[PDB]
Amino acid sequence: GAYKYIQELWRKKQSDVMRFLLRVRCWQYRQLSALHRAPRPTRPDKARRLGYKAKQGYVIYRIRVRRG
């Protein structure tokens, strides 16, 4: 019911309703560590279409690399 709305909201990732949340999450993840464990996906639709199922065993890491 909802994942197509989440997908279409994530697509236009330049709009004002998304870029605020993106800036807040970038500040949060930058002030976090380099490699750690997120206990739940922040993108449920993208995680589920890549293969995440909400059950015991599947692990989400959050990881930071450098550009360039």
Partner: protein
């Protein structure tokens, strides 16, 4: 009375030492404490979009208590009474050989996909939308969707209190669809106030901008400069 003198200590600078004060605002807090505290401060400082400033504009506690008293007797069944109803209905259909003992079971629906389906198909009579979902993208489409489909929605503070009426940690959404005979007037009394609060003012809320609040030290500094400017002008 015999000796019992007073021994005062003067706590000024350059004499007897300072007592143990509260020291709450000055202790070196850890990384995640500073993360969540400056995260809340950052949401207070920055200008939030007009689709997420709808949060903190939520339902008051009297109407939330009325909503909880309405939702308490539409609770979904847990595992114990679920297995009890299964075994009881199986024993009754094995002994008495009944065909349709249950006419209509009244129960609400939970889950964002289920609620979105019910509002797209207009089966929902009332929508309860939680406040404390940390990815707000999962929630932001629901007020405009309920507004365009005409289903009334109420924003409530606390997803834990909504999970404890569904026997789960997070619930995030509650859809009132089926009503009993003794609850139609009370549900209409709730829906009238909810449509007065949210649906008749969605066009007013969507134009408003949230956030844009400076820190209290800077507010006091600007107020002191304003009072100095008023003193210089008069």
């Amino acid at each position: 009375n015999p000796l019992f003198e007073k021994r005062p200590k003067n706590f000024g600078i350059g004499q007897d030492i300072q007592p143990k004060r509260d020291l709450t605002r000055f202790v070196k807090w850890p990384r995640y404490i500073r993360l969540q505290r400056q995260r809340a401060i950052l949401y207070k400082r920055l200008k939030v979009p007009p689709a997420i400033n709808q949060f903190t504009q939520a339902l008051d506690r009297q109407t939330a208590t009325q909503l909880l008293k309405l939702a308490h007797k539409y609770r979904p069944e847990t595992k114990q009474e679920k297995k009890q109803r299964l075994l009881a209905r199986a024993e009754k259909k094995a002994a008495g050989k009944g065909d349709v003992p249950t006419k209509r079971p009244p129960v609400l629906r939970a889950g964002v996909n289920t609620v979105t389906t019910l509002v797209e198909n207009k089966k929902a009579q009332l929508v309860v939308i939680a406040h404390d979902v940390d990815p707000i993208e999962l929630v932001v489409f629901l007020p405009a969707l309920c507004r365009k489909m005409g289903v009334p929605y109420c924003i409530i503070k606390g997803k834990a209190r909504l999970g404890r009426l569904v026997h789960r940690k997070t619930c995030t959404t509650v859809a009132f669809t089926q009503v009993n005979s003794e609850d139609k007037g009370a549900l209409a009394k709730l829906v009238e106030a909810i449509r007065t609060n949210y649906n008749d003012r969605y066009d007013e809320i969507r134009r408003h901008w949230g956030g844009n609040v400076l820190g209290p030290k800077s507010v006091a500094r600007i107020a002191k400069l304003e009072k100095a400017k008023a003193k210089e002008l008069a």
